[PDB]
Subunit: 501 residues, 4 copies
């Protein structure tokens, strides 16, 4: 493919793609492994927010009753989220808070979800729930101050359209929960941004009904949130895996555009859309998350998602996760960008590569994005998504690039099936479920992207880049001006080194 890149760009590539990221339940943020991962993530990708479950679930331990006199009185315990939210700010990432699930002692019923058993029943008392919300949100304000907390976003629950996350998928009782929550939030401070309905795909009439509910009853909404996944249901389970086929990335972008339109035609036309969960597969034990295909796939979404949505949050930044029990093996199919022992998966590198793009959009299509940075250098992320089985499937992309700076340093980073892929190498080691330190160390060496560099002189003010992508490669290409200093090394002559010319 021959893509002629212009010197100038009308558009700006926005940073929506790294606005927010996902995470396993907040209680897992107490784990050193977790925070190692979060550190890595925030050093290499700069997420602004993080979005998880469990804030009000009982391992974090906020909501209790507590026998005083002979009445059960509510007790709010911030010991853990203080630590959690602190560890977050310390890593320059803010909570996209998600109020859920139901504390056990506030639950109206038994139903739970996940291995860690988040209670998914409504509050036995909405006054108690509201007071939870007021307490938490007020607690946050005390700890972090109002100006900090105002930058946070507060989602109400999670996937209420699903029977697993909300008793009977009750639209009406969710809307009651939304309204008590949204009102509770604004009552603490009116700038605080509360939103919903946190629905998973398959039920976008919920967004419309949610926005009709909010307009009709004058319920505050500051954003719509929605999840996006492209995996069909499991066509094969093992004791530790769900294998699922996938719709192409276009399916996710159409999901985004569709929900943007629902918002345009609603009484709240100006509302931000945050996709608070996205990946390929929605199961934390689907091995696709460990693969290069995941990288290549998710790159398209990084490219284009931001046209439709104010943010879209990769579920998750890390394999530290337990919705489906403790990981049974190093590469076990989890959502994480980072695997246990801080081994980036290929998808991590995809974010790393997008994080090198500039603001100025020179060219974008369905398999690349090409940007100018403020120093005049170019940054391109290209990907070769291939959802079909088979080998080779190399795609050459020819890039013609405007460069006035007579010489250029090109640095290219590739992750694919061979490179930046610890999953492949893990396989070769015997798929050790519980690898030794040495094996982890090799895995990490191997998980680094392949780097290639060159100096190229630009003939006619043009650089012609032949970029050969292999199956499911995501690659970062940067073209820097070379300010050559060779001429200051007077007499320099590598021909005077043994073996060199």
């Amino acid at each position: 493919g021959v893509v002629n890149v212009p010197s100038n760009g009308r558009e700006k590539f926005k940073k929506n793609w790294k606005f927010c990221v996902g995470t396993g339940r907040l209680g897992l943020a107490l784990q050193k492994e977790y925070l190692d991962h979060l550190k890595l993530v925030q050093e290499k990708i700069g997420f602004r927010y993080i979005r998880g479950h469990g804030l009000l679930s009982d391992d974090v331990g906020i909501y209790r009753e507590v026998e005083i006199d002979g009445e059960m009185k509510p007790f709010y315990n911030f010991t853990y989220i203080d630590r959690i939210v602190d560890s977050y700010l310390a890593l320059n990432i803010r909570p996209f808070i998600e109020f859920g699930f139901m504390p056990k002692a506030l639950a109206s019923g038994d139903q739970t979800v996940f291995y860690w058993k988040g209670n998914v029943t409504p509050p036995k008392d909405y006054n108690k729930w509201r007071d939870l919300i007021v307490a938490v949100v007020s607690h946050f304000i005390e700890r972090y101050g109002i100006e900090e907390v105002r930058t946070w976003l507060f989602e109400v629950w999670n996937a209420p359209n699903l029977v697993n996350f909300w008793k009977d998928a009750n639209k009406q009782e969710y809307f009651k929960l939304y309204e008590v929550t949204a009102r509770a939030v604004k009552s603490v401070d009116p700038h605080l941004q509360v939103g919903g309905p946190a629905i998973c795909g398959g039920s976008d009439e919920w967004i419309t009904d949610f926005l009709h509910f909010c307009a009709e009853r004058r319920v505050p909404v500051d954003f719509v949130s929605r999840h996006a996944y492209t995996s069909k249901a499991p066509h094969k389970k093992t004791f530790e895996y769900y294998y699922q086929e996938l719709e192409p990335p276009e399916d996710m972008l159409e999901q985004f555009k569709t929900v943007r339109a629902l918002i345009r035609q609603s009484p709240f036309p100006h509302l931000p859309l945050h996709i608070t969960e996205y990946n390929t597969s929605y199961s934390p034990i689907n091995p696709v998350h460990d693969t290069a295909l995941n990288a290549a796939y998710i790159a398209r979404i990084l490219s284009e998602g931001g046209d439709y949505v104010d943010s879209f949050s990769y579920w998750t930044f890390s394999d530290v996760f337990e919705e489906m029990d403790v990981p049974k093996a190093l590469f076990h199919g989890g959502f994480g960008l980072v695997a246990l022992h801080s081994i980036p998966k290929p998808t991590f590198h995809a974010f790393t590569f997008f994080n090198a793009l500039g603001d100025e959009l020179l060219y974008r299509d369905g398999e690349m994005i090409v940007t100018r940075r403020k120093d005049g250098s170019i940054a391109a992320v290209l990907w070769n998504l291939v959802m079909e089985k088979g080998e080779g499937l190399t795609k050459e992309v020819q890039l013609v690039i405007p460069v006035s700076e007579s010489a250029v340093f090109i640095k290219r980073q590739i992750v694919n099936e061979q490179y930046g892929n610890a999953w492949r190498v893990w396989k070769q080691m015997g798929r050790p479920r519980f690898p030794s330190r040495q094996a982890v160390e090799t895995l990490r060496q191997v998980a680094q992207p392949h780097v290639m560099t060159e100096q190229r002189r630009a003939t006619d003010g043009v650089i012609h880049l032949s970029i050969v992508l292999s199956k499911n490669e995501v690659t970062l290409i940067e073209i820097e001006q070379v300010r050559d200093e060779t001429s200051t090394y007077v007499g320099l002559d590598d021909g005077e080194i043994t073996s060199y010319s």
Copy 2:
């Protein structure tokens, strides 16, 4: 050619090769860059000793006078060595102390050497020198304890046979020095291992005459020390470089062997030989040091060195160095295993690869060493030294390794003219003298060994490795037993992941 690696080995590959390592002057150990460098070097190569000049030179500031009442009296400032040596022991490296150069205020003349102007004249008074030595040795014992200082070694002066390092290259006067120093040391504790004559090559009758001076006069010697290089004197200079031709590595090994023999024919037939400086070139501004050639070259030394010499200390661990002024550019020909910004140079990777070898020497010729680890894995370092100008020059090596382990994990790391070579990429950047942090980080990325993994079945309890070395490649190959766990993943099927088979 075809190498049939025996299943078993009588001989043990010893750790002589990393007993000790070279350093820029001890004063420079105060530099944060220096410690960063030592720390990397101690994490990836665990050297036991570090040997450098400048212990008694005036930047470290031990020796002074000091008009106290009405008298110029000696003052021993240990502020800097306490901190230097402390920093050494904190990194699990002990000093191979070298008593030099002449404190300015103890100097008998003004001849200095180097940019930092180490004085190279005999002491104006040997009684004061003696006391310096007693004071230093004593102070060390007081700070670190007698048990610890006894593990240290003590060389006396540096290169006294060279006019640059010692006034008139006075053999007789350097023997006076050695005697005063050796006795000084021993008078403090008889078990302190003192030695000399730390000579450079070209005048090895100094070993003979030194050890007869020691026999005649019964001067304690506990080892012989000697430098060893293979570079002729510079035949080109720039304002910045020396370019030297190198003798091949056999010349260094014949140097080792011939000195060993000279010691065996001496009155002290059994003394240890510590080669206290070695590289290819002896100039810290010979770009050869930053190349792959350097690594391939030194790899043979690591392999055989221990045959003839109890230790051999690579000059140096780091480009933190000043003999020829402050590095005028990132890669500037410095002795260092590690370049500024902690960019491993190819020779670094050589040591690191030797660090992965086992005790059991299975096979060794002049281009490889093969070893069994105590868990039964093989570790083999192969190098392809090519001193002749020109491209290509690839060696095909065929390694036939035994192991009744069925399945095998091979990890291969290569560093050559393309991989693990930040010098070649520095040049592509336009030889930035003073690189941006971004350039540095690229350089670091690129300085990493290229890793290649595979799983192979064994046929007939044998692995057959067809190994292709590029020019001046050093490569580590490890063959580990795969204890394969895949069978525990019942239902595991990569064929159920999108794109995978």
Copy 3:
């Protein structure tokens, strides 16, 4: 009163006191907070062993089924203990392993203990319990090597004599469990030191019977294990506290003495006694743990416990704990030496003070220990336990100490009701449950022990220390030799500095 310290000591004060230390369950070692706390504890007190609950309980996640080829087969997930033990060894602590509690899937009934719901029923199948032990112990050996694991200890279950921890406190069923476990361990390696009965107090015929059981059936036992507390059952509960009266520490030492005597009467008279949990109170929400009284109390135990027992393991090193839910406030009555946010509690400082003592036991009574270090210096720890309510209550102590020195530097460190006491200060702050970072730093500053130094000249080779201990003071006194260097500062006169004399 008056105490004349012998210049020489017959006996050695041993390190039994810091052989082992308690931890809240192993699952919590995943917390970054837990490890912060351990690093701290390992730098200031060097514990060799760490004994905790929950190795096999389900948060750590080892034991699962796992439906494979039509059966429920065991699935040993090592993800979490690998990470846990790793981190233990990285901080130079080994597991005093305690095989408990029942994995939910291995359990025969529903009885749990604690908020974390450790199952306390017999295995539904003792063969599978055997295979669990074999799996875990084997796994450890496969990861750490046999020479490492052989240094560990293995306690079977916890407090089988209590109904809360073991169905019916069934003695015969516990012996069955112990036999199965002890043989399973030994079946893996005969060096693996296994032991019980891990009983709480009140019921020491369990030792007698347990050992009778083992003699009769030739069941391997390598040590006896026992808990030791001195608190009566809670007389007052709030929703967050258990308040308890305490027996004096002689009571604990009598427990030690008495259980050792039951071992000498038994068929295994020479068996090690490891007291694997002691504290004052056995409630993790008794505020007593946070006080200076706890420190002063336990210092007597540190002083004398080793006379009777091979180890005694302070429950716990850290307030990272959850047996009674998540800490409801910074100081919440947790067992920890270390409070959250790495705030040392008074008791932490007691260990620290014992960590400064020498081998040579010069003098000891029930309020002090005095030791000679090998450099010749004295180290004394003194405590003024005062269990009575009220203020004042200051012990005077006249130490008369031989010193072979003449000029002496004394460093006293004190923690008591004023200093080294973040609890008192936390109360002044308004008892914030969830203190801000600022408050926490203040608490940490204030948690440090008060230091008083002084130079004293000996008279007639003796130092006469008049020491006043406030109520529940634990104080460390070190008397070190001064090698005065002031004479070398010729002309030094502080009287030539503004204001100084």
Copy 4:
């Protein structure tokens, strides 16, 4: 003396006091010790700028020549200052650059200053000098960007009115150097802030003459810079100390006010004034620097200096220094707020305590500053300077603060002759010149300010605080509102803890 602190104050206490700080020559910035110190300084006191010598002196290595052909051509080496200025920015501190001294290779003459021998002669060629500056400033802008460099300040030379620092203290020649420098700076970018004359006191007609010179010859000046000290010429020397009397703190403030007047009376009446060096003693071996008096003395300067000068830069932040050779002992009278081994001296605490103050000035006089912070809390630094010899000499300050809050947590911090004073304890240890690590740790533990806390109820809507300062005591007091949480601890009763009430 009683002070009725008003609730609100019209004026702001400015942060001029910590705008900038002094340092040893930039070359020492390369030392690990130095950066430990800077780290600490920047974690506890937040300095915006750092100002020292040697930028162009040859240890930093920027100016060389460099025989190319037969010509000596200038060569600029940025290897060191890149690493220095990076290390600066990483620690959030910016260079208050100072162009000096003369590179040997550029020097017109042989006169040097200091042990390290900065050349203090005019350049041999002013074009060469100019080119140096352009080179240096262009480099900065290249590496860090114009926006960043525009925030830096550029002083020309140091103390040109002193014969030691400038050949013949030649005024007219300094103005030539100034003009050439300032013109060189402004030619690179006009917004770069260039300034001088960097004079030491006792010669202020130079500021007048300088500003007339610049006014008349239209030479750019953006700031006046000046040094301020109060020590008289030494009255005793030892081989290692200068001992000096000190004019009182008013003398310095009057120096500040006098120079502000000369500036107002000048052709540039609104120029900022930066005191680029102040301490009490101008010698780096005056033990007053090490003392508590230093602290209490510098406290009035921090309180008030800002009225008269835009900045005032305490020479120096650390003892890493060599103007008078390597430190001969731990506390050796160096300028540093931080002693070697990162042990803060009392003075460091004064900056720390001042760094606790709010912006809103409630009350100030010559012994205290009392401020309100944005959360309504009070912060006051009180000082009791006593320049006379003698014991005791305390000082009661009675602050009467309005608070209608019911209750108050008070946190006080004291460094005086007893507390926060490691010099005092170092003396008790026998003035170890080169202390053991154990000794250093005691020293550090002792270098911490004494902390006293209490809770105080309000009476009459007011708090009456009696603050006893002892000799040369600086003390920080913070009064915060207590939000008492005790009522939530329902049933709490410390009375139910052994020994407590």
